[PDB]
A paper describes a structure:
An icosahedral reconstruction of the procapsids from 28,566 particle images reached a resolution of 4.0 Å (FSC = 0.143). 3D classification of the data without the application of symmetry (C1) indicated that only ≈1% of the shells had portals incorporated, and no further attempts to reconstruct in C1 or C5 were therefore made. These procapsids show the expected T = 4 organization with hexamer/pentamer clustering, and at this resolution secondary structure elements and many side chains were clearly visible, sufficient to model with confidence the proteins that make up the capsid. Cycles of manual model building and real-space refinement demonstrated conclusively that the pentamers (subunit A) were made of Ccm while the hexamers (subunits B–D) were composed of CP. One striking difference is the exceptionally long, extended N-arm in CP, especially in subunit B, where the chain could be traced all the way from the δ domain cleavage site at residue 129. The Ccm N-arm is rotated by ≈80° relative to CP around a pivot centered on CP residue L163, and folds behind the P-domain where it points towards the interior of the shell. Other major differences include the E-loops; unusually, both proteins have an α-helix within their E-loops, but the location of the helix is on opposite sides of the E-loop hairpin in the two proteins. In contrast, intercapsomeric interactions are sparse and mostly mediated through the P-domains, which interact around the icosahedral threefold axes (formed by three C subunits) and the quasi-threefold axes formed by A, B, and D subunits between two hexamers and a pentamer. At the icosahedral threefold axis, the N-arms from three B subunits come together to form a triskelion-like structure. Our results suggest a model for size redirection in which preferential incorporation of Ccm pentamers prevents the cylindrical midsection from forming by imposing a constant curvature on the capsid shell assembly.
[name] pathogenicity islands (SaPIs) are molecular parasites that hijack helper phages for their transfer. [name], the prototypical member of a family of cos type SaPIs, redirects the assembly of ϕ12 helper capsids from prolate to isometric. This size and shape shift is dependent on the [name]-encoded protein Ccm, a homolog of the ϕ12 capsid protein (CP). All tailed bacteriophages (order Caudovirales) package their genomes into preformed procapsids made from capsid protein (CP), with a ring-like portal protein (PP) forming a unique vertex at one end of the capsid.
Residue numbers in the entry:
A (entry chain C): 152 to 393
B (entry chain B): 129 to 393
C (entry chain C): 134 to 393
D (entry chain B): 129 to 151
Amino acid sequence: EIVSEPFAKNQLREKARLTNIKGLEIPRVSYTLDDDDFITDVETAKELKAKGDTVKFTTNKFKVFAAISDTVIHGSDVDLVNWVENALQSGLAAKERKDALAVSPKSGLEHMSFYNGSVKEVEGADMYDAIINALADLHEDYRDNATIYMRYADYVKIISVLSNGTTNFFDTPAEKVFGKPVVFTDAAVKPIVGDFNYFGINYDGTTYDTDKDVKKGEYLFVLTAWYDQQRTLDSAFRIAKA
Amino acid sequence: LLHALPTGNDSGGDKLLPKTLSKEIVSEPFAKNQLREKARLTNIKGLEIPRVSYTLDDDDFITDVETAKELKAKGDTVKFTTNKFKVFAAISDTVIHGSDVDLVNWVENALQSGLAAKERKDALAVSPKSGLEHMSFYNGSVKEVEGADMYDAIINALADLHEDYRDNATIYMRYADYVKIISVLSNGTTNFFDTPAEKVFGKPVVFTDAAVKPIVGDFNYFGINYDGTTYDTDKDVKKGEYLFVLTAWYDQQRTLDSAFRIAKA
Amino acid sequence: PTGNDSGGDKLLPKTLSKEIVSEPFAKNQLREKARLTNIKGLEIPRVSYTLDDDDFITDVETAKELKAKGDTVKFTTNKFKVFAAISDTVIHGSDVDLVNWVENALQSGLAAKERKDALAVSPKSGLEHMSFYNGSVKEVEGADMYDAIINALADLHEDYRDNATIYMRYADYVKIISVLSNGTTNFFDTPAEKVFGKPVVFTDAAVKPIVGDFNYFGINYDGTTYDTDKDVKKGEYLFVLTAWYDQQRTLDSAFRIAKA
Amino acid sequence: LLHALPTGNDSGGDKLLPKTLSK
């Protein structure tokens, strides 16, 4: 009987939080120390003042589909059970990663993306300089917990300049070059970096349905849900650029 | 093409979602002190540990080291002295009544994280402040050595140290500096990035971003303690905020300052 | 912190519903006087009775319409559809509109369908015979609205007069007062029964005041059917209802118009 | 999107009509 792989996945689910709570509200600033605090970084003064202390997780709709013609049903195969779950679950993942890493987001969902704007682009001479400088920019608390996302091909080019003749960092991991964990993803254009503790997602509710289009002779299996994902603090996550 | 009325609002699609969903907020500590591993911790009140040990009635009145004698002339004992602390949490009003969640970890992760950030900051402070000068390694009490490059410096740092203290020595430095040391050594030879850091210098290493200059020495002498804590809640009515606040008392001092050094180029 | 439980609910008012409710969105004023029926097929005679030999000739009108239409009257089915649409988010936000919001909605749809057709200035084709302004009613002419209504009563037959009723828009009932201002006296406080001498009902659609014996006018609803379905893709439930009715005038000569 | 055959012709919408009907 039939089986297959996850057709698509979201790499960002590794580090980000994931929730199922109906309405969700958290504070942005975890703690403040005693009187002898050097002034909080100019950034956090601005965004905290503008956004407010809390953060709103606000429902947003979409729809996922699935279509099976009638002949396929009546040829002794069982795709009703597994082919759809393999299909719909993947649809949830691609919807996320498309919106977060959108170069030019659709309207009504700008605030989710990391490339919509409102993040500072540092400038390194090459990719190796830009990533290390970007770590040099953000606040140190975020640095200690930071994580990098990038495309694997860019990790090859930094090796060609760190070829150094005899030595070959094709065998080395990527943790030890930059000094922090790395995850590889093809959509991420400009290497982004920050503490992905703060980034978070929430799924509130769903509903599963099925129906037959009698004339055209195709079953349907549809699902819907509402989610949203926001950055607790924009000042954390930063860009690298040549 | 059915006639039923979904009044119940029970959702069948819930199981299709990823099974890693939390239903309760959780996160890791925001900050941590990386000195706690090597150094000594204590809860007792009013601590005093003598500097002296190992007297011989020697006719060869040379002690161990010239630096060791002249700075014991400072004093016989060390006495840790109390210093004040303050920690604030600030969960607001909407979050409490807006929805049913649980924040006890969010508070806990915030408070005892704040302690570690305090004691690391002052102990590694570049420019100390009033009353706090007597714990920072970058205070002028401790020496600088001078290698031509930072590699030979750390060697010349671990070199001019007591035989004993060398044995359980330990190094602190930034990782970014640690890379430049190796990109130059890897020229025309084996790779070192696959190697542990214990071996290029011979002894264990820990990495933190604070140490603008390296440290070397045995941190069994560096010591910390906490006298006792105070915890109480509070509500500001006019604004709506709930306040969770902590205060305790502490000090940290090094037993002997000759056991530690600074490398520099 | 235990939760958002508090004692403010006592301070909160007592008029709070805890679930949704609303008014009839629209109504048909004509249902007060007209007959209303549920019979499958309905047939009645037009002329109630005739007296003995000494009957002055029946009014020229009734001779004509009775001769043309015939003795009986046919109630003939005519279709329409009423709709209702609820998006999916509205369902899944803990509210109960399934039970009351629809009945409040559909029942109103029946009423507006009636009054639209009866008082239609220019009816849709296939349903001309229902309206009162399609034609076939005589328009008397008064110098003002007060003269036109009273003259219109002077026109129709007296049996219908004794049982007659007037429908009009309230604003026209104000203008007749301004001419009957008479200085000191003010008929804003008076009812309208006593000015014209017969009952009155107020309605905004009725343009030219109509008048006659609304015993004769009648309505019938034969059958219905209630259905529901989901448009899966667009994610909206539906609640639809249908029925067949018709309403006719037993005798056209009764109901008359007033005009300036 | 149901499979049933309404043979009975019993009408559920009857009660929605006004309750002042005469018969």
